[PDB]
Amino acid sequence: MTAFSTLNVLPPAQLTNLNELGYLTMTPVQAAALPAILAGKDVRVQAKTGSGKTAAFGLGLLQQIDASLFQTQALVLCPTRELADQVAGELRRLARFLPNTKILTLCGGQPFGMQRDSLQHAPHIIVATPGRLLDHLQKGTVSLDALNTLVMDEADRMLDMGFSDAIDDVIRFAPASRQTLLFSATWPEAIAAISGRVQRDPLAIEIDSTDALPPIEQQFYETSSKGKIPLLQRLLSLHQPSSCVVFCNTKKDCQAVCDALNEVGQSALSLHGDLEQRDRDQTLVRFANGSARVLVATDVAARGLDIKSLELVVNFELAWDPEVHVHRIGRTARAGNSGLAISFCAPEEAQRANIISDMLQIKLNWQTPPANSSIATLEAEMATLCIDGGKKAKMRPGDVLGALTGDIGLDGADIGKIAVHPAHVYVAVRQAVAHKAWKQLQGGKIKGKTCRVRLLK
Amino acid sequence: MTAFSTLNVLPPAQLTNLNELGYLTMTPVQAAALPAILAGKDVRVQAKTGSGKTAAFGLGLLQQIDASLFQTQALVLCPTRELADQVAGELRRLARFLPNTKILTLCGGQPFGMQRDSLQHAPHIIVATPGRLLDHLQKGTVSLDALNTLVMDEADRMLDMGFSDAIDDVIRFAPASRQTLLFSATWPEAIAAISGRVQRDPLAIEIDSTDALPPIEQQFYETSSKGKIPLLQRLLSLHQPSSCVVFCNTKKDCQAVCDALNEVGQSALSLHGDLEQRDRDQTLVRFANGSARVLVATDVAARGLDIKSLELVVNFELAWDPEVHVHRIGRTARAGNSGLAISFCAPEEAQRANIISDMLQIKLNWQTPPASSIATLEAEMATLCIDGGKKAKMRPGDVLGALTGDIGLDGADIGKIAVHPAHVYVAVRQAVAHKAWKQLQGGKIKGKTCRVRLLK
RNA sequence: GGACAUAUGGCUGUUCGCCAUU
RNA sequence: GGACAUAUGGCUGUUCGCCAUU
Ligand SMILES: Nc1ncnc2c1ncn2[C@@H]1O[C@H](COP(=O)(O)OP(=O)(O)O)[C@@H](O)[C@H]1O
Ligand SMILES: Nc1ncnc2c1ncn2[C@@H]1O[C@H](COP(=O)(O)OP(=O)(O)O)[C@@H](O)[C@H]1O
Ligand code: BEF
Ligand code: BEF
Ligand SMILES: [Mg+2]
Ligand SMILES: [Mg+2]
């Protein structure tokens, strides 16, 4: 029985949904912010990473959704496409209590035409990045006239110098009589002081100070820039993390580190803005489901990404801003878990390490370099099958699991994460059984119908 | 220089284009119909199958294309989606003489929004099936206001009872002052009499009578309906055709025969209207490049499809109309080749065999069934599907360059390369297919990384 | 018969389905 | 720096590019 019932607002169908979903206890940010949000107040919330802010504003805006009114009623803004799809994915699971709730994602990298076609049936909720959404607004394919709530996730990033104009351009399409929710784990005083420009009489709910991190152990290594890649390979050999995210400050360094890790057999993929959007999506799928051991990324992955039970974060180079460092290490130690965050520091980056030390009021644990120089390989335990169809073909996870376990004859313990995307379904299978599964499912049948299956790298 | 120079009309760049393409001699329909078309006249043409009608109307409409004018100036209508894409494929090859010529296909099975997106830059030429084109016309995403030429390939099918309404609906968007070209190998007089409704004082160029077939040998077998599938398996085991098209009259029989052929190990794919369009496209790709030995199809493949050096056509059931029989067997013996067409005849279908006998002025060569065991038919190739296509600026040379250079493949192990709008299909011999797929998966084409799937 | 065509979404992790109207 | 964004096409089967204006 869920503790969310103590709010005395949510309908019984939502309480049953939360019980089936496993939301049995409210996190602090949920307990502190949901009553005000459900009452229609504007809020600015500050809570640490991985503490459930998504459901905090998601349960809030869902309470004011009328499924019979086929117009857009809630809008969520995110700084990155992968985060936007993730937030929309969790909103959909929270919206199960309300049948026929259409939640649409509007991001770049997708062709404009398919979004225009989907927008003829106006979605109740839009989760979007500012760029593609503004395009749709200017061409009259999206209307905000029926907007009840506007949410800005990672709101200090959405209000910075880079996003302010695009955010301002979007808000002129929004009604003034709206609930505006701003959520983030970090709030620079400059950004927080001006944050009222997009709100009406907001309540400040600052339950975690900026130095109140999740349980993250931090280690720091002195190294020249030239020694970073050899050090990283040796540290990954020492810790042997089940999953690891390595952060770089440039797209060039990001791809270079990924290629260096794959050259020594340490299963790595890259995630940055010069990749094709399909590769960005498939890389995140394969890293999350265990088809890759290490993810090398720029700050496109610094915020909000919720990779389950991430063991290790490595700062190949310290971020330009200390707030970004907080978001990076926040990729681990989520939802009550602990984590380890290693940071490399060249002499030019010493001052950024000092700024992080002051802001977080932590003592840097400088480590002595490893005793062994041996570089071991890291093989990924899973491989990803990509089946054509997705939600358009009404292929649900039970169909994939049923087909894989039946005539194709696989053990249910050999199948990991199943992710249903709009046009594809991704399945994780143990590496040893992946090739047989691919060939047998290619000439088999799923849901009575024939399928097209790909085996990803 | 190519004999096309004797037309004294084509620009020099097109004469060079024809020589590089291998069009060194004009076919009869090209030699007989192109002067009138290049002079701007409406024509109704009757020429046998596989004798070059596409270039006949393709060179015609391209002569009146203004590349600086970014409006639709030529429209080609086809009865099937695969034929429309095929006709556009050869039009692009013929349009190399004119840089920056946009030829777009408008067919069903493709998402509407992506087509709307492409239509912001209006294409010079549209090749389309009537259904999806009319949708675009009614929604104002396509304009025929600047149309110079209108082509109806397989014009006798486009003017029949099933298409008449939609064709009229399309023509309502076209100018009356237009060149209208009608091509087909078959012309029922009833359809030919009403064909003038869409033309302006047309020239009739009927160089092949309906019985003037390409060199196609025909054999006929008496058989029960129950004995058809075992006979087919035995005939394919005897003949071992490198490629074969088996025609059925229903979508159910089409899939049933395909599955029975695969049960005895005779590499077969199916092509019919109940398939997803992606399956239809990939089936035609894999059959055309040798990744399957037998193609089982309904009459969706009866007309216009140009499969190179197709060895055998089998009529599992005789078509309802004799003209469709002409188009079916016309899938073989193309562009000067010979071919074999076997037909099965159940007692209920004897009447259809006689009608074919009269129309084609042939005496039926009835065969006695094979003395015979059922053998396997292995596909010699496998198809790699690379993501990108023309959207990613991938030209066939890039794929071949990556396969032969870094990945280290023999150039003689790579067959047909087909650049589609979003994908590139490559045929490689099955013995090397898995190695090619895996190494191209972790390799790079054109400097950039690729994501490669193996269809099989 | 065969073509042409066939909107947009919601729904249990052992499939072959069940719903909504835009 | 990193996000957001990044139109539509043409180019001769041994790639890593070259062009057009919408
Ligand atoms: N009340 C809850 N009970 C159990 N799990 C939760 C609860 N709220 C959130 N979670 C899960 O914990 C993780 C926290 O994710 P997220 O909301 O992205 O944190 P934040 O946005 O604050 O960084 C998510 O995987 C979410 O599904
Ligand atoms: N003048 C020519 N010289 C050589 N080959 C040609 C010539 N014209 C056409 N071809 C080829 O011959 C085949 C005839 O195809 P197609 O035009 O579809 O015939 P039809 O439309 O008359 O059935 C095609 O593969 C085409 O590329
Ligand atoms: F702060 Be959470 F990681 F969005
Ligand atoms: F008449 Be051809 F086969 F198009
Ligand atoms: Mg979040
Ligand atoms: Mg033709």
HEC assignment per residue over chain A: CCHHHHHCCCCHHHHHHHHHHCCCCCCHHHHHHHHHHHCCCEEEEECCCCCCHHHHHHHHHHCCCCCCCCCCCEEEECCCHHHHHHHHHHHHHHHHHCCCCCEEEECCCCCHHHHHHHCCCCCCEEEECHHHHHHHHHCCCCCCCCCCEEEEECHHHHCCCCCHHHHHHHHCCCCCCCEEEEEECCCCHHHHHHHHHHCCCEEEEECCCCCCCCCEEEEEEECCCCCHHHHHHHHHHHHCCCCEEEECCCHHHHHHHHHHHHHCCECEEEECCCCCHHHHHHHHHHHHCCCCCEEEECHHHCCCCCCCCCCEEEECCCCCCHHHHHHHHCCCCCCCCCEEEEEEECHHHHHHHHHHHHHHCCCCCECCCCCCCCCCCECCCEEEEEEECCCCCCCCHHHHHHHHHCCCCCCHHHEEEEEECCCEEEEEEEHHHHHHHHHHHHCCEECCEECCEEECC
Provide CB contacts within 8 A for A267, sequence distance 6+.
A261, A292, A293, A294, A378, A379, A380
Cα–Cα distances in angstroms (integers) from residue A99 to residues A17, A47, A76, A91, A390, in the given order:
12, 31, 20, 13, 19
> Six-digit token pair at A415?
């199948």
By C-alpha to C1' distance, C18 is nearest to A394
Q: Measured between CB atoms, does A113 come within 8 Å of chain B?
A: yes
- Asked if B117 lies within 8 A of A117 by C-beta distance, the reply is no
> Six-digit token pair at A57?
């504003």
Provide CB contacts within 8 A for A158, sequence distance 6+.
A77, A79, A130, A152, A167
Cα–Cα distances in angstroms (integers) from residue A184 to residues A85, A324, B38, B310, B396, in the given order:
18, 12, 69, 65, 49
**Torsion sign across C-alpha atoms B254, B255, B259, B260:** negative
Q: How far is CA B208 from the centre of its chain?
A: 21
By C-alpha to C1' distance, C9 is nearest to A102
State which amino acid sits at residue A80. Answer: T
Tokens 């099965």 locate to: B344
Beta carbons within 10 angstroms of residue B36's beta carbon: 17
Residue of A nearest to B283 (CA): A452
Cα–Cα distances in angstroms (integers) from residue B148 to residues A77, B36, B200, in the given order:
49, 15, 13
Q: Which of B116, B454, B456 sits opposite A113 (nearest CB)?
A: B116
> Six-digit token pair at A423?
């046009």
Q: Mutual orientation of helices B130-138 and B164-171 as an angle, nearest 10°?
A: 40
Residue closest via CA to ligand 4's atom 2 equals B49
Q: What are phi and psi of B283, to 5 degrees?
A: -65, -45
Bridge partner list, B150 = B75, B180
A438 CA to C16 C1', in Å? 20
Between strands B414-419 and B423-429, the pairing is antiparallel
Cα–Cα distances in angstroms (integers) from residue B221 to residues A61, A297, A441, B354, in the given order:
71, 67, 38, 13
> Six-digit token pair at A2?
């869920």
Domains and CATH numbers, chain A: 4-206 (3.40.50.300), 216-360 (3.40.50.300), 382-456 (3.30.70.330)
Q: Measured between CB atoms, does B389 come within 8 Å of chain A?
A: no
Q: How far is CA A342 from the centre of its chain?
A: 21
Tokens 């209208």 locate to: B180
A192 near A44, Cβ under 8 Å?
yes
The reply to whether A53 sits in an annotated binding site is yes
Distance CA B381, CA B291 (A): 4
Q: Is the CB of B327 under 6 A from ligand 2?
A: no
Q: Helix, strand, or coil here: B448?
A: strand
A203 CA to D5 C1', in Å? 33
Between strands A244-247 and A294-297, the pairing is parallel
Bridge partner list, B445 = B448
**Geometric angle at alpha carbon A388, from B436 and B451, rounded to 5°:** 30
Q: What are phi and psi of B124, to 5 degrees?
A: -65, -40
B415 CA to D15 C1', in Å? 17
Distance CA B177, CA B149 (A): 9
Query: B3: closest CA among B39, B55, B44, B54?
Result: B55
Q: Measured between CB atoms, does A135 come within 8 Å of chain B?
A: no
> Six-digit token pair at A22?
């496993």
R_g over Cα of chain B: 22
Distance CA B135, CA B141 (A): 9
> Six-digit token pair at A355?
């700024």
Element of type H or E holding B416: strand B414-419
Distance CA A350, CA A391 (A): 49
Residues of B in contact with A388 (CB under 8 A): 278
Distance CA B404, CA A434 (A): 28
> Six-digit token pair at A53?
């802010």
Q: Helix, strand, or coil here: B274?
A: coil
Query: A83: closest CA among A265, A331, A268, A259?
Result: A331
Q: Mutual orientation of helices A81-94 and A277-288 as an angle, nearest 10°?
A: 60
Rounded to the nearest whole angstrom, what is the distance from the C-alpha of residue B50 to the centroid of ligand 4? 5
R_g over Cα of chain A: 22
CA distance B249 to chain A (A): 22
Tokens 């700050």 locate to: A299
Q: Measured between CB atoms, does B447 come within 8 Å of chain A?
A: no
What contacts 24+ positions apart, CB below 8 Å, involve A98-105?
A: A98/A13, A98/A14, A98/A62, A98/A65, A98/A67, A99/A67, A100/A67, A101/A62, A101/A65, A101/A67, A101/A125, A103/A127
Residue of A nearest to B115 (CA): A113
Q: Is the CB of B49 under 6 A from ligand 2?
A: yes
Q: Of how many residues is chain B composed?
A: 456
Query: B216: closest CA among B360, B30, B27?
Result: B360
Provide CB contacts within 8 A for A184, sequence distance 6+.
A45, A46, A53, A153, A154, A155, A156, A157
A430 near A399, Cβ under 8 Å?
no
Distance CA B245, CA B255 (A): 13
> Six-digit token pair at B167?
């064709």
State which amino acid sits at residue A55. Answer: A
A111 near B118, Cβ under 8 Å?
no
DSSP single-letter state for residue B273: T
Resolution (A): 2.5
Beta carbons within 10 angstroms of residue B177's beta carbon: 8
Q: Measured between CB atoms, does B336 come within 8 Å of chain A?
A: no
Q: Helix, strand, or coil here: B442?
A: coil
Tokens 């301002």 locate to: A168
Element of type H or E holding B256: helix B251-263
Residues of A in contact with B451 (CB under 8 A): 278-279, 282, 456-457
**Torsion sign across C-alpha atoms A287, A288, A289, A290:** positive
Bridge partner list, A385 = A427, A455
**Residue B224, Ramachandran bin (φ over 0: left; ψ between -120 and 50: alpha; else beta):** beta
State which amino acid sits at residue B214. Answer: P
B404 CA to D16 C1', in Å? 14
Cα–Cα distances in angstroms (integers) from residue B139 to residues B115, B133, B173, in the given order:
12, 10, 12
Beta carbons within 10 angstroms of residue A78's beta carbon: 26
CA distance A419 to chain B (A): 19
B106 near B115, Cβ under 8 Å?
yes
Beta carbons within 10 angstroms of residue B378's beta carbon: 10
> Six-digit token pair at A12?
């019984």
Q: In what order do the strands lie in the sheet with B244-247?
A: B268-271, B294-297, B244-247, B312-315, B339-345, B216-222, B366-367
